[PDB]
Amino acid sequence: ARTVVLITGCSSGIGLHLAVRLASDPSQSFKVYATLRDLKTQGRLWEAARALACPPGSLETLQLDVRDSKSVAAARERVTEGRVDVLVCNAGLGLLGPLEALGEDAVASVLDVNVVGTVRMLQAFLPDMKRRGSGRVLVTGSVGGLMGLPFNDVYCASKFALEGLCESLAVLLLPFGVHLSLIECGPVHTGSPEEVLDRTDIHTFHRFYQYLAHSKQVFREAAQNPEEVAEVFLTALRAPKPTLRYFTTERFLPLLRMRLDDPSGSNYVTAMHREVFG
Amino acid sequence: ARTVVLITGCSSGIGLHLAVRLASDPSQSFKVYATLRDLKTQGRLWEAARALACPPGSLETLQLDVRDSKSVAAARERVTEGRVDVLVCNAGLGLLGPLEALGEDAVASVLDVNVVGTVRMLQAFLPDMKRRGSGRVLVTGSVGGLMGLPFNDVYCASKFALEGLCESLAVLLLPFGVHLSLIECGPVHTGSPEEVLDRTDIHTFHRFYQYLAHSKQVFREAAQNPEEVAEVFLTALRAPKPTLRYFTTERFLPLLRMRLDDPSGSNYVTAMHREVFG
Numbered sequence A, B: 001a002r003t004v005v006l007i008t009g010c011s012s013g014i015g016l017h018l019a020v021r022l023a024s025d026p027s028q029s030f031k032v033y034a035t036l037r038d039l040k041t042q043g044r045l046w047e048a049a050r051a052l053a054c055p056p057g058s059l060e061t062l063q064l065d066v067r068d069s070k071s072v073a074a075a076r077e078r079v080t081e082g083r084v085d086v087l088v089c090n091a092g093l094g095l096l097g098p099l100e101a102l103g104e105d106a107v108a109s110v111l112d113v114n115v116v117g118t119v120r121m122l123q124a125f126l127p128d129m130k131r132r133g134s135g136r137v138l139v140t141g142s143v144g145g146l147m148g149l150p151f152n153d154v155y156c157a158s159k160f161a162l163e164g165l166c167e168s169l170a171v172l173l174l175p176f177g178v179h180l181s182l183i184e185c186g187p188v189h190t191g192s193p194e195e196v197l198d199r200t201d202i203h204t205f206h207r208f209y210q211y212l213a214h215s216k217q218v219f220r221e222a223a224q225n226p227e228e229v230a231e232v233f234l235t236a237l238r239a240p241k242p243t244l245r246y247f248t249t250e251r252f253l254p255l256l257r258m259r260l261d262d263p264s265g266s267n268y269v270t271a272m273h274r275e276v277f278g
């Protein structure tokens, strides 16, 4: 009896690498349903699967668009084993820009995919885990769900929302035998400028391209290998008493300690403004 | 001139009390635009205003539905002074129940009002504040945005979301001279059991009714009057250097410190489960 894993957002990045890590595991103890918003994007997954020699039957692909609870439901029905031992809620969108330049539809989509989409997944799959008295739920988290990042206001809103959702659930789930964990990632190796200028003031326009310069520098320095990140998910699964959070890096725990010394919140604001804008 | 204050969610509660507290101020320092989802519900606001003899012109009402960017824009345009000195984003919904028993449309509506609605407000009013280089924004927060609360998973998601949104913006806004503050409230005074069971499970059912009983007791002991809450808003807007957060109560400091001592979340999840479920 293999451990049945279902993962959202497997076309690229963390989801792709986790899927093939699990499916290729030497023990052959995982059966992986790697789900993608659009099945047409599955090529890279299968290329990576072959590169790691995933055994026949260890990896299957399903269409699962987390905006659509019928898509969620149909994917659940395709789990031939009739159970999910490990649910990985990884699908997510970023959104980068001055707040007032972001389209109202882009803002709503980020919330719908990142927050409501995770709700849809939990509504579909949590009940059977709770009834059975076992199951692991791993949710891809972000440093941006723990501290605010300029020009990522809506992304951060959505990642903070997941902290609140997951923590609230973890309090109830504590003695159910069902274990929810957030995997907190920093950076990971995986509008037009007219529009931005038209939709904001000149000072914000400047600060945005200052931010983009500083963000490329930090990304070059701090972007983790996706294999290293995937392995933290595996560690959380190995744990017999998994914690609510795991961190893929200690790089930001100083900021997190400092942030939480100051209940007023303004020391963080000052420090992060200085770190980003010099 | 007077300080121009625009407040959302003024039909009742915190919004109503703050609107009339500012408009009835003996010094007549404030011109208040009190906004309501539906203008037809303004009767109680005007009764409270007349009860405090709010002078003519100190208080004006507009319809403003935070779900509709056209409503937000139409309200902004009615501000005859052509500026807002203090914006109060107070409009909000609650949602209580086992996650899997909640309708997806109800979940979506909470995030749309509480989170996207606040984004719409900020998108419409920040640009003028940034351009003129001054402005204050006060946002109704919750201790449920700082720590997760069982059976309030979506409400907490939305309150955490406002933490991330506001913190991210505050980093950018420091050198613009536009100040953002969250007013962190504790509790505030304002399906069928077989349906709950059928949609969940035997353990969840027991915990839910345990939660409800315990919650009823905490509301009796700890819930604050909207007037007391309104007074904390007044302090924040009068602060020469306003901080990111103001707390209406110190009652939850212990659980809050429990949370921040242990970033893994273990100490908090255990402590909160013990607090709620005994």
Ligand SMILES: C[C@]12CC[C@@H]3c4ccc(O)cc4CC[C@H]3[C@@H]1CCC2=O
Residues within 6 Å of the ligand: A143, A144, A149, A150, A186, A187, A188, A214, A215, A218, A219, A275, A276
């Ligand atoms: C804002 C930031 C640069 C950009 C990083 C970044 C970039 C992309 C991303 O998906 C996540 C993150 C999280 C950390 C962010 C940094 C923290 C300190 C700093 O200067």
Ligand SMILES: C[C@]12CC[C@@H]3c4ccc(O)cc4CC[C@H]3[C@@H]1CCC2=O
Residues within 6 Å of the ligand: B142, B143, B144, B149, B150, B185, B186, B187, B188, B214, B215, B218, B275, B276
């Ligand atoms: C969960 C809780 C009851 C419900 C409270 C509650 C309810 C509604 C709300 O808007 C805020 C809060 C904040 C504190 C919450 C309590 C902490 C300890 C406890 O037993």
